[PDB]
């Protein structure tokens, strides 16, 4: 079911990582932008 | 705090791993808007 | 559509103009992502 | 218009960036207007 290769696992996690270490007004923009590529 | 806190980001973490992978590139890339300087 | 695509890039491009700077400047990093 | 109070920099910085984004293909156009929408109040 997870079919992610490693090095698309740390990028995904390194994505976590950089939006949790944005300020919190960045990351509800991160949010609103999510989902305009949302199908 | 808390609580809302962790909802919204299982659920926009959630959301970037329901895209697809062009998608989560792109998203990537964005992201990085935010911390280049 | 030309109609169509004209008014929704000039829609687009007031937008950005009535934008705050550092909106504007975030939206021009944004757009170098797609370029 | 005549009551455009940028600074030529900040006005060829803009005319840059719509030129940057005519040149796009129309899928990325479109999602870049997505984008947008969310920076508004």
Same mark, same amino acid.
């Given at each position: @079911?997870? /079919? =992610?290769? &490693?090095?698309? =696992?740390? /990028? @995904?996690?390194? %994505? %976590? =990582?950089?939006?949790?270490?944005? !300020? &919190? !007004?960045?990351?509800?923009?991160? =949010?609103?932008?999510? @989902?305009?590529? $949302? $199908?």
């Amino acid at each position: @079911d997870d /079919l =992610r290769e &490693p090095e698309e =696992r740390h /990028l @995904d996690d390194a %994505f %976590f =990582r950089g939006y949790k270490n944005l !300020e &919190p !007004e960045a990351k509800a923009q991160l =949010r609103k932008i999510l @989902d305009t590529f $949302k $199908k």
